[PDB]
Write an enzyme that holds these catalytic residues in place. Structure first.
Site: not given
Length: 279
Positions: A39, A69, A161, A224
């Site tokens: 990430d 994130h 998404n 996520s």
């Protein structure tokens, strides 16, 4: 053990019904397992990690999480208050820049790094990788994820998404890894969640409270956010000896909550990640 006043997603994955607020779990808490969060990095200094997080690889001029994130996803894996497996070791691999972006060449490089790096580390309960990332279909990227899984790592990747079939996204479309869709606190499929036959499991993904950069917290939404619930759960069950890296995704789906989500399109599994912890 029981965490009163826990984030609704932690409560969801220990309950056969939505609307509850206590997270029940075996006190082992993923002790002896390791989870690579691939990430934007992890803010290891965050008190919520209790010194159980470290960086081990970056592909940019800094290894610091300048976005949040990655710290948010790691917090769902193993932070004390926001984590599924509260005693697991977290390892940060920064393949995503501080804008959230990452080249595929870099993400593949990170997955190959994890397969090798696990041999430097003491993870007697096994190794998990959480990939809250993805993009359009790439066969090299899927290949990278299957290699990591084959090497002995439990891989969980976000379904995406795009409110579309995940067959057209990667690594979401790789059959050998665990592809995680997102639901909300009312057991609806999340408005943005991808779907399709490649999906293996659903996890909490809308309005997920977790750690953020700067010693802070915040709620955000995404597949996520569902991935580390499943990643954390896999490490939890592995610590417990209930399952192995190669079989955790199948184990999680065989023991999920079945048929409880709404707006699951035909041809997509209706399975919500569940720890079946009975004190």
């Amino acid at each position: 053990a029981a965490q009163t006043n826990a984030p609704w997603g932690l409560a969801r994955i220990s309950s056969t019904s939505p609307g509850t607020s206590t997270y029940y779990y075996d006190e082992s808490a993923g002790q002896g397992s390791c989870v690579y969060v691939i990430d934007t990095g992890i803010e290891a200094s965050h008190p919520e990690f209790e010194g159980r997080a470290q960086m081990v690889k970056t592909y940019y001029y800094s290894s610091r999480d300048g976005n949040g994130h990655g710290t948010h996803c790691a917090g769902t894996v193993g932070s004390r208050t926001y984590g599924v497996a509260k005693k697991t070791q977290l390892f940060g691999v920064k393949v995503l820049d501080d804008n959230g972006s990452g080249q595929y060449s870099t993400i593949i490089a990170g997955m190959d790094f994890v397969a090798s790096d696990k041999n430097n580390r003491n993870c007697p309960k096994g190794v998990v990788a959480s990939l809250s990332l993805g993009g359009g279909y790439s066969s090299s990227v899927n290949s990278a994820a299957a290699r990591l899984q084959s090497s002995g790592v439990m891989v969980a990747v976000a379904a995406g998404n795009n409110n579309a079939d995940a067959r057209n996204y990667s690594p979401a479309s790789e059959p050998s890894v665990c592809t995680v869709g997102a639901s909300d606190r009312y057991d609806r499929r999340s408005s943005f969640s991808n779907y399709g036959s490649v999906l293996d499991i659903f996890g909490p993904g809308t309005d997920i409270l977790s750690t953020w950069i700067g010693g802070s917290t915040r709620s955000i939404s995404g597949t996520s956010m569902a991935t580390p619930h499943v990643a954390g759960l896999a490490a939890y069950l592995m610590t417990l000896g209930k399952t192995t890296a190669a079989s955790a995704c199948r184990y999680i789906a065989d023991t999920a909550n079945k048929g409880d989500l709404s707006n699951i399109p035909f041809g997509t599994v209706n399975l919500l990640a569940y720890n079946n912890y009975q004190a």
